[PDB]
């Protein structure tokens, strides 16, 4: 069973000029991706102080790099709060709603796209390199889902199959024919080093073959 959801107006207005303008400062997508999931891991940390049970889903805090040449993607993988279908589906667009607006606002005031980040839509940055995004999401309170966008207006939920994730989300980027630089070991290095040095959780590249 396979849901199709429409996106609002104004976040599809804002996955198109992601698509369409030209900005050539791609790499600053796995700055926001990193972000989003260190603040994930935050969350969880935090809720396990008052009720540790909310970590028997898995201790480990942590984010994983993970590359595929031969399916063409990039994984990021973290242990954090992870997702429920109504974040999924009406809570992340709610947010998102006042956060688009507030950044077009910026960019027609001559802001530019890396500062996405600031008005909370740092995710809609992986259609900088990305043709499809699967987000696998696993919170304590819900069951696994996998959400997935080609952008063109609309996104699919449906219950995950896959490999039980435990607890948190793997945003699984399908990278453009032309974006293939963002499966190299050295490029990947590079822009941890350069955008996300201080992340407070141990951040594993992995290597192919
Ligand atoms: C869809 C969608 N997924 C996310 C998302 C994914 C991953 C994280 C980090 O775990 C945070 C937000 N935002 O919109």
Do not use: C
Not at 67 to 81: A, F, S
Not at 163 to 183: A, F, N, S
């Amino acid at each position: 069973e396979v849901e199709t959801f429409a996106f609002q107006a104004e976040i599809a207005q804002l996955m198109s000029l992601i698509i369409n303008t030209f900005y050539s400062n791609k790499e600053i997508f796995l700055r926001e991706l990193i972000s989003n999931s260190s603040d994930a891991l935050d969350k969880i940390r935090y809720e396990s102080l008052t009720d540790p049970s909310k970590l028997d889903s898995g201790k480990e805090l942590h984010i994983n790099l993970i590359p595929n040449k031969q399916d063409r993607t990039l994984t990021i993988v973290d242990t954090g709060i992870g997702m429920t279908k109504a974040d999924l589906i009406n809570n992340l667009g709610t947010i998102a709603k006042s956060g688009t607006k507030a950044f077009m606002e910026a960019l027609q005031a001559g802001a530019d796209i890396s500062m996405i980040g600031q008005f909370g839509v740092g995710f809609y940055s992986a259609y900088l390199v990305a043709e499809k995004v699967t987000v696998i999401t696993k919170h304590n309170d819900d069951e696994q889902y996998a959400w997935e966008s080609s952008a063109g207006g609309s996104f699919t939920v449906r219950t995950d199959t896959g490999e039980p994730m435990g607890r948190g989300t793997k945003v699984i980027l399908h990278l453009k024919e032309d974006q293939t630089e963002y499966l190299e070991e050295r490029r990947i290095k590079e822009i941890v080093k350069k955008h996300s040095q201080f992340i407070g959780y141990p951040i594993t590249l992995f290597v192919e073959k």
